[model samples]
Target chain A: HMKHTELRAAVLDALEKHGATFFDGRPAVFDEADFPAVAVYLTGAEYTGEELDSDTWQAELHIEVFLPAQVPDSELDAWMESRIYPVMSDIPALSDLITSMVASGYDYRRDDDAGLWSSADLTYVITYEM
Target chain B: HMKHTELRAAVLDALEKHDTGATFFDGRPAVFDEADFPAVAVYLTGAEYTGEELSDTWQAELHIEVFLAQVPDSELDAWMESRIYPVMSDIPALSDLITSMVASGYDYRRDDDAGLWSSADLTYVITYEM
Candidate 1:
């Protein structure tokens, strides 16, 4: 069985390997210094099987890529669509833990006063046996 | 007891009343544009989401982070303490949803490329049974 901690680390590591500055979404906010960085978190998880620890678990993860306001919205959208949108398959570490992973959808907003921003929500269907 | 949506709305409303010119969001943005400075993001660090089929019993641990730009390091502390810090208790919206809240801690950082930024994390334990 794959542990959530390990899975999270592996997922973030893969993003980092592919030129992403990543942060663990938690008690603290992403360091503003790393403006153009990615933040990942395990938002929600549901276990499904005949027995509690005996089946598959689906995890919902949220990823936010904060880019400098200087970056055009078009370029940000293109980068995510091209480089980051692909699910766990690109990450070798997630091959066993994640049976299926996908980009459920995404939301983008530009602050008239604050500027531009974008984010994506991903769903992962993971299977492991006790 | 409390719906996450209602609680979230209350918190944002309170913050908005306190500071008229800051951009606030639940969580964060994917692309942070330059104009978005003085941005505040709110999220639940933890929560209890189980109850009788139709019971009004919900609890959450909330964390709020304030991000600023171009502010002097010396003034950051006072800025949050005086102008943006009163939302926890002074706002009526929070009193309706928040059972208890405290300024748990904070973090600050500066970037030569990104400018200056600071964040405050407030812990709010709320319950809605009615």
Candidate 2:
């Protein structure tokens, strides 16, 4: 992967573009430490939520999340169609990708008149193969 | 809209198909009560942090989130491509659709001799009109 560095760069750039500032540790079941801001884990027969912290190997699969405002579900999809698929589309090493989701609506009208940070009303999850 | 009931059903169905079962409350700045399983809030003109629970008004916009394993980024796109786009395609009331993302690779090792759970290695976001 000559573009491995480029690939990492693109990954970070995309996250920053969408505003991913928080960090959450992966489940110990996977054993993946060294919490990276981004990761890619797969779902298949081999997937057992185990052995995710093997330093012996590189390209470790992982799962990452962005806040509701940080990255809305819709825009995230558009970005993938544009940036990701073009670069990794031909990489057969990776195969059978997919995502599942839910979208909810909220009305902003409970007026406190204090003008400050607010909370988001819905949650979305986008999983894929590692 | 005459399709309100149908609209809500489709929304709930989409979520169930994706497998989202977490409950997080909206920040107090919005002041909405009784956090339901799903909600929507708009983020444009007339959007105020002071109030997100306007019982007097309906059709409030909201934000949502999902977990990594629950929703891998790639498949999420394909699902949206086939389901979401067409239904909302003609609804000009909503505009601008986009997605941003990162894909990472992982190796399963550190053989504790027991196969089990794992972690995902990528993050993705898809945001759109309210």
Candidate 3:
């Protein structure tokens, strides 16, 4: 099995269930014809060289939400808030795979051509038998 | 024991054991004192009937609040990643007392006054009998 496979799947499923129009890794070109597109990518993964097969693996999952340029800052914040919260709350499937899903930071920016984009960097530190 | 007594105490003890030099409260204190800088409170915010006979079966909403002062957002998140989350795994120690312990999610708050205060709300959905 590949590393961070479970983490990636869980994060993707959570947001998709919350009603994001498009989903995938960071795009070379924003391919979605829909607004409020989502992009998820892995920044880092750490493995603790411990014993007993209880390896502590940590993955940094960064999520980017792309929105139309005409949207207001508050609306962007609201859109991000609505989509991001379910990933953190009442986690039925996602919560079980990873031990911790702490939000590290958020960045909001607007590109001349790319429109408005918000990024949330979340740290998922987990311990599982591998 | 009274209703929600041991359930509260048991969860309280579990949180108390996780960190030292931090205050623990069964309910929110009227005043958040200075010594109580790094305080944690577990409040039974809501309850509902699930299935009951001689006893009551409840799906309780527990708001586990962590109050802090003059903390950098980065460090507070790190503390949660390192300290607060491990307890989520260790809570099965209460397996006998509880039917299910679900960690719903976290709600973090940042304040301006009181020596630059900030706090976090760790939402827990506890299923138990009384």
Candidate 4:
């Protein structure tokens, strides 16, 4: 099977291609300091296997769109589903290893001092032989 | 206004009371081993200390990073939506030291090598006369 780092590199490349400001953990910048920045975080993975030498891994990710508090939630929704989804949907087709990638769910929150933000979660399943 | 550390202590104490198993750290953990799963780390990213010197007044920005794996979907959300926010929202009312605590914005992500997780950023603006 491909190394997990290799798999992550493939996914990160795809995100970078689509103009995502992605990170492994907390975003390097903040919307409070730098508004209008969208951050993508790659947070976790799960694996299952019938044999020790092979496994199927599921990768979960979340996306956050940050904008000024003056902005509406509709705009954040548009940015994720309308703008980000198209590029993300193409990942499975673009990569030889990524079998499927899909949006799982989402949520939103508004901050009185910070700003308004929206977040979505995604999962990708990869099958590989060790 | 209270010092940044004092405000952060109040926030962390409240989070701990909620049984969120939260921790105050310098930044994202360098290593996310099994011991660190379901990890919640809070750090100060930036601040704008205003008012005259020794005025005991300033503004602060903070980042809360949550990490988890093989857990319920809403586990982390509970920490943010229920535990963290409840305490943060009541800062002004709960503490004679705090003038205001507001959430500015937040973000999320999924990583391959790491586990699944979500994060939120908060902004607090306070005014007090020392």
lDDT of 2 by residue, A1-130 (tens): 3323333343334444443332232222222233222333222223334244521112332224322223322333333334433443233222223222222222222223222222222221223333
Best candidate, DockQ-wise?
Answer: 2
TM-score of each: 0.44, 0.22, 0.44, 0.38
Model 2 accuracy (lDDT, Cα): 0.28
Error of 2 at A106 (Å): 22
Give DockQ: model 4.
Answer: 0.02
Off by over 4 Å in 2: A1-37, A44-70, A92-130, B1-130
The better candidate by lDDT, 1 or 4, is 1
For candidate 3, lDDT tens digit of each residue in B5-29?
A: 5555666788778776577776543
Query: Per-residue lDDT of B16-67 in model 2, one digit per residue for the tens?
Result: 4444442322221232223432222112211112213322122322222211
Quote model 2's TM-score for chain B: 0.25
Better of 2 and 3 by TM-score: 3
Task: Please identify model 1 stretches exceeding 4 Å from their true place.
Answer: A1-130, B50-56, B70-73, B98-103, B109-116, B128-130
Q: What fraction of the native alpha-carbon contacts across the interface, defined at 8 angstroms, is recovered by model 4?
A: 0.00
On a 0 to 100 scale, what is the lDDT of residue A79 in model 1? 61
- Superposed Cα deviation of residue B116, candidate 2 (Å): 36
Among the numbered candidates, top lDDT falls to 3
Writing each residue's lDDT as its tens digit, candidate 4 over B16-117 gives 777656544423344444465556665443343344554435444555666665455466567667656766666442366656555566665445454444
Candidate 2 to truth, TM: 0.22
